[PDB]
Design a protein around this ligand. Sequence first.
Ligand SMILES: [Cl-]
Ligand SMILES: [Cl-]
Ligand SMILES: [Cl-]
Ligand SMILES: [Cl-]
Ligand SMILES: [K+]
Ligand SMILES: [Mg+2]
Ligand SMILES: [Mg+2]
Ligand SMILES: [Mg+2]
Ligand SMILES: [Mg+2]
Ligand SMILES: [Mg+2]
Ligand SMILES: [Mg+2]
Ligand SMILES: [Mg+2]
Ligand SMILES: [Mg+2]
Ligand SMILES: [Mg+2]
Ligand SMILES: [Mg+2]
Ligand SMILES: [Mg+2]
Ligand SMILES: [Mg+2]
Ligand SMILES: [Mg+2]
Ligand SMILES: [Mg+2]
Ligand SMILES: [Mg+2]
Ligand SMILES: [Mg+2]
Ligand SMILES: [Mg+2]
Ligand SMILES: [Mg+2]
Ligand SMILES: [Mg+2]
Ligand SMILES: [Mg+2]
Ligand SMILES: [Mg+2]
Ligand SMILES: [Mg+2]
Ligand SMILES: [Mg+2]
Ligand SMILES: [Mg+2]
Ligand SMILES: [Mg+2]
Ligand SMILES: [Mg+2]
Ligand SMILES: [Mg+2]
Ligand SMILES: [Mg+2]
Ligand SMILES: [Mg+2]
Ligand SMILES: [Mg+2]
Ligand SMILES: [Mg+2]
Ligand code: NA
Ligand code: NA
Ligand code: NA
Ligand code: NA
Ligand code: NA
Ligand code: NA
Ligand code: NA
Ligand code: NA
Ligand code: NA
Ligand code: NA
Ligand code: NA
Ligand code: NA
Ligand code: NA
Ligand code: NA
Ligand code: NA
Ligand code: NA
Ligand code: NA
Ligand code: NA
Lengths: 337, 56, 132
Amino acid sequence: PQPSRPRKGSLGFGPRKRSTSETPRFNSWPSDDGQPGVQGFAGYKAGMTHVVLVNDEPNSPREGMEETVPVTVIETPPMRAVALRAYEDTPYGQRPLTEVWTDEFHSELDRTLDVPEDHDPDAAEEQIRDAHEAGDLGDLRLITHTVPDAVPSVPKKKPDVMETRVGGGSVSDRLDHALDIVEDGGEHAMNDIFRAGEYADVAGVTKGKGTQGPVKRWGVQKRKGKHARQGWRRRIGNLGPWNPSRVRSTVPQQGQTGYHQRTELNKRLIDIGEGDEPTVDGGFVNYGEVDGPYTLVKGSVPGPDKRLVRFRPAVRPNDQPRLDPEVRYVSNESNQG
Amino acid sequence: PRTRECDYCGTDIEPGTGTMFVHKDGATTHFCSSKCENNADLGREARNLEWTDTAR
Amino acid sequence: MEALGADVTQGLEKGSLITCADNTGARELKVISVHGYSGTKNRHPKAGLGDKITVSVTKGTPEMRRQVLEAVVVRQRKPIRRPDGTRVKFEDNAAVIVDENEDPRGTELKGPIAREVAQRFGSVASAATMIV
RNA sequence: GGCGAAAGCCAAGGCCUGUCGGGAGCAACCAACGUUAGGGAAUUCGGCAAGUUAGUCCCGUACCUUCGGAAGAAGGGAUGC
RNA sequence: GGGGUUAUGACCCUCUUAAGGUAGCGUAGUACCUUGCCGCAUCAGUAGCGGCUUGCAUGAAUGGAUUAACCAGAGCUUCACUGUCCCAACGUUGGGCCCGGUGAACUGUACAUUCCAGUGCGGAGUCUGGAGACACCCAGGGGGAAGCGAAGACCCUAU
RNA sequence: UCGACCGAGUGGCUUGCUACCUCGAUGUCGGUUCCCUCCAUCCUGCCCGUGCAGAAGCGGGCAAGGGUGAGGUUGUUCGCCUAUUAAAGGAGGUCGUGAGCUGGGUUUAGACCGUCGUGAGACAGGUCGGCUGCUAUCUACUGGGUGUGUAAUGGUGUCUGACAAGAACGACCGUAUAGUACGAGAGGAACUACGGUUGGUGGCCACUGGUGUACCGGUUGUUCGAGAGAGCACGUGCCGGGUAGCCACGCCACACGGGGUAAGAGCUGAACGCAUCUAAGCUCGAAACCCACUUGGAAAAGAGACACCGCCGAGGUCCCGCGUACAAGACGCGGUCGAUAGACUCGGGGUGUGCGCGUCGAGGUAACGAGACGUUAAGCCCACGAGCACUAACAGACCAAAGC
Ligand SMILES: [Cl-]
Ligand SMILES: [Cl-]
Ligand SMILES: [Cl-]
Ligand SMILES: [Cl-]
Ligand SMILES: [K+]
Ligand SMILES: [Mg+2]
Ligand SMILES: [Mg+2]
Ligand SMILES: [Mg+2]
Ligand SMILES: [Mg+2]
Ligand SMILES: [Mg+2]
Ligand SMILES: [Mg+2]
Ligand SMILES: [Mg+2]
Ligand SMILES: [Mg+2]
Ligand SMILES: [Mg+2]
Ligand SMILES: [Mg+2]
Ligand SMILES: [Mg+2]
Ligand SMILES: [Mg+2]
Ligand SMILES: [Mg+2]
Ligand SMILES: [Mg+2]
Ligand SMILES: [Mg+2]
Ligand SMILES: [Mg+2]
Ligand SMILES: [Mg+2]
Ligand SMILES: [Mg+2]
Ligand SMILES: [Mg+2]
Ligand SMILES: [Mg+2]
Ligand SMILES: [Mg+2]
Ligand SMILES: [Mg+2]
Ligand SMILES: [Mg+2]
Ligand SMILES: [Mg+2]
Ligand SMILES: [Mg+2]
Ligand SMILES: [Mg+2]
Ligand SMILES: [Mg+2]
Ligand SMILES: [Mg+2]
Ligand SMILES: [Mg+2]
Ligand SMILES: [Mg+2]
Ligand SMILES: [Mg+2]
Ligand code: NA
Ligand code: NA
Ligand code: NA
Ligand code: NA
Ligand code: NA
Ligand code: NA
Ligand code: NA
Ligand code: NA
Ligand code: NA
Ligand code: NA
Ligand code: NA
Ligand code: NA
Ligand code: NA
Ligand code: NA
Ligand code: NA
Ligand code: NA
Ligand code: NA
Ligand code: NA
């Protein structure tokens, strides 16, 4: 009597509404086991191509043989860690304490912030160290931003600004490590945080679909057979039982679909290069040509071309890193045709 | 990546693309594209198609 | 089961009529069920290359007809994907009758078998003329 | 045009009055439609809806029958310039 | 109906009430038991067809049986076909959405931002206890207002 | 393990009883679609007993997180049957769900048969046919805006996390273990480590596939005298191919572990000098709970934190060119110190070799001639990219930090 079947779509990604921030904000950070280091990076989505690879999986019967793998090319020029923020531990949880800022700024950063003309870094740094001595110091993160002007395919000169955690080492060593990076002007690269063959989590705001119906948005069935000709095609049977007499939020309905934040786990970094190697004949469709620092990600990444995406080291990897996998071939074939 | 010619038009098949059709008798045909498969399915011979490397 | 070493889009359903490629005297087979398979509400049980299926003999010798047997799908029209990315597809859909031990019921196979079917059933591969 | 007072296209003649317009690749959803790989009635009370077939000529045509029919049975081939 | 005496069945009776079902057909558009039993067909067939048939309650112009041709008549099978289905996608035209102009109706005891429970003429937005709840507006698909629409056709009652 | 008699109960899913609610109407059965729940648990996890050697079972405990599917007859619910399966559990939500669908059955008006009736007609007996209204005021929810409060000084950017949601994962097969332990043999495991499949989930479009009334070609009828080049044939005449995009049939990703427990296994340990897993104390132990992970989240009225900028000016709105965005609104980018859009050119793509002329051409006195070859990877076309300030991003307008 009515075979069962799972509900339509997950309830874990709700409410499905427009993201308030087109720059994604990481909900979690990797653990502190390693040496002091910045816990993420960012870049701009270009497109897709494929790659022939040598299977490095020790547990595959195909180990050593060639495999074709899909890749999303992301332009990953260096970013600037322009400040160091410290969090205090309080009964209400973590709160920003103070910030140590550089005096050295990229020319376009004033399109976004009101850049400090007058700051006292040492005072801030002192406040931080006093906190550490009191054992109230709870976290250390860098205020960082991208340099889209270094990516001509992307129309924006206005930088995207995001805060990224610094993990690893003792708190003291971590503090020093953070301060060293910032004072320079903060310039750092994909090279510095990530190595090819490692797993990253990639976060991004998905392609916007605007308003869509429950069939697309939730995966409910279309009306079937005779039912499909009666005046109803794409609508669900009912909004609920007689009682409770109200519509539950769990029933699939139309609404904003796409343009949500997603964090996708365990994305293998196939290569971190620079130059025009990955670029496709004719240009990446609706994007442009890539010549410059880039990252190849196994498979797919959330978002349309030009969208900012964020990297962090995998917080829950299934597999051991197999470093620097061998790339036999990278297709430059036109994506038109 | 061993490069193969398309058994129809004769251009080099891009690695990691295309389709092999296995015939009834076990003979084998590598196609570089749908365009070529479909042209073949019309019973057209590539040597008679001017745009084809074979014909050229 | 053992990995096929290929990704399959199942091209067959419960009820599909396919070729019996072998000398058993069964000509046409009707798919009934798919071994180890569980579907979902309204979904037609689906079978493809390398699956073991329960089968019914629709066409053939009087003694083979109406019999319910097991078989293995050795060819399908819907493409499969090989690890180099290329697709492979056949001229028909074909299965080979097999016993409880997965040994072919007949002494001879008719036409090509897909290479991946060897990664599963040795006895069937062994009896193959051509493997592609 | 073709068997045609058929279709389709076009004269003569009539009309732009089956009388509200402007804008958004113009979203969801609905009306009326086109195409849809592999499978091929598994759908459903039920092939409902849709699809298949199709004009003409030649070959050929079963059971049954009130000898009139059944019959365009079925099936096969041809078709332009 | 009830009794005497070589497939269907035969003959003689009795009783009611005149006769006592012939030729046929039969689980029927008539068969309660019933998805009757056997067979065909299907992987599987309360269906369909054939045979059997004691027929709850068949049968001879209350016409019986049967039947070529005919049928927008009821049921079933096969080939072919296919978006009916697996499982949905994209596209086309008119709407929908925004703007100018035109411009109704249904409905309205009052109050009303509700939800979970309880209670109550036993099926509450309004009572009781809690929970939740900043206001206004746009689009949606219709869960609830035992939604709107019709002094219930059912059922009983009316000298 | 099965378990009579008799005795005591629990549920409110059947059936019956009652006649309390509605006859100025609370739309039927079955099905469907979509959501939530219960546990008396079918599978899965952890256990106990066994008439527990193993394997396969049987019975029981905890446990509702997830799963429990596809078909043949029948309107059926139910049930019968088939092949699969880890298993193909059972209930409640107005016998959930007709301002959602369907309309096969019950139960209108037509008709037939059987039975009953003198008859009109009847049956609860069978049978063929037999309709599905409404523009949403309130409430409810899914999504999108505008305001106010926080704030007797605004703004830019970055965060916090009270709380809220999730199944974000469930399950199976195979290999090594191992023809090993166990067993006379027949037969035949496990821990662990691997590989894959299935169902669910979120995203993506290099690959394969669909679309693609952009585009290119072929061709039928007709009209523009022919040619060339075109219109119509339903919103492409038809056929062949198909770019971008959008898509699934394509591709990528989706857990360890820790903490606390249930059943259970135990430790120490009295009451009760012994014994005792329990009374105090403790060690362990479920797919369940909590954390972990993903999503939302300053209106959290204790209405938050940090840094800088600004209070005659920070910043914002309007405007203009656009689109990583979009039903209005919103959102995001660019605006000459500029590649934001268009033109042009090149690149990268689609089609498949243009008009004209030359030669050939079955033939025909000739006229004429379907078609073939060359010129010609031609002609035509592009939703993409680059180069390039040539055109257009001009001109600008406005709000903005209150009082004793
Ligand atoms: Cl439906
Ligand atoms: Cl991993
Ligand atoms: Cl099955
Ligand atoms: Cl239905
Ligand atoms: K009533
Ligand atoms: Mg209807
Ligand atoms: Mg492409
Ligand atoms: Mg290609
Ligand atoms: Mg179903
Ligand atoms: Mg439209
Ligand atoms: Mg199809
Ligand atoms: Mg077929
Ligand atoms: Mg069916
Ligand atoms: Mg069905
Ligand atoms: Mg029809
Ligand atoms: Mg019968
Ligand atoms: Mg029967
Ligand atoms: Mg008579
Ligand atoms: Mg009460
Ligand atoms: Mg109250
Ligand atoms: Mg009345
Ligand atoms: Mg009456
Ligand atoms: Mg009602
Ligand atoms: Mg229990
Ligand atoms: Mg549950
Ligand atoms: Mg109900
Ligand atoms: Mg229900
Ligand atoms: Mg309703
Ligand atoms: Mg209705
Ligand atoms: Mg309505
Ligand atoms: Mg009906
Ligand atoms: Mg009926
Ligand atoms: Mg009826
Ligand atoms: Mg037209
Ligand atoms: Mg035609
Ligand atoms: Mg070209
Ligand atoms: Na309708
Ligand atoms: Na309709
Ligand atoms: Na209702
Ligand atoms: Na004429
Ligand atoms: Na009679
Ligand atoms: Na008639
Ligand atoms: Na269709
Ligand atoms: Na409603
Ligand atoms: Na009752
Ligand atoms: Na009433
Ligand atoms: Na119903
Ligand atoms: Na459960
Ligand atoms: Na059934
Ligand atoms: Na009701
Ligand atoms: Na109904
Ligand atoms: Na209705
Ligand atoms: Na634990
Ligand atoms: Na606030």
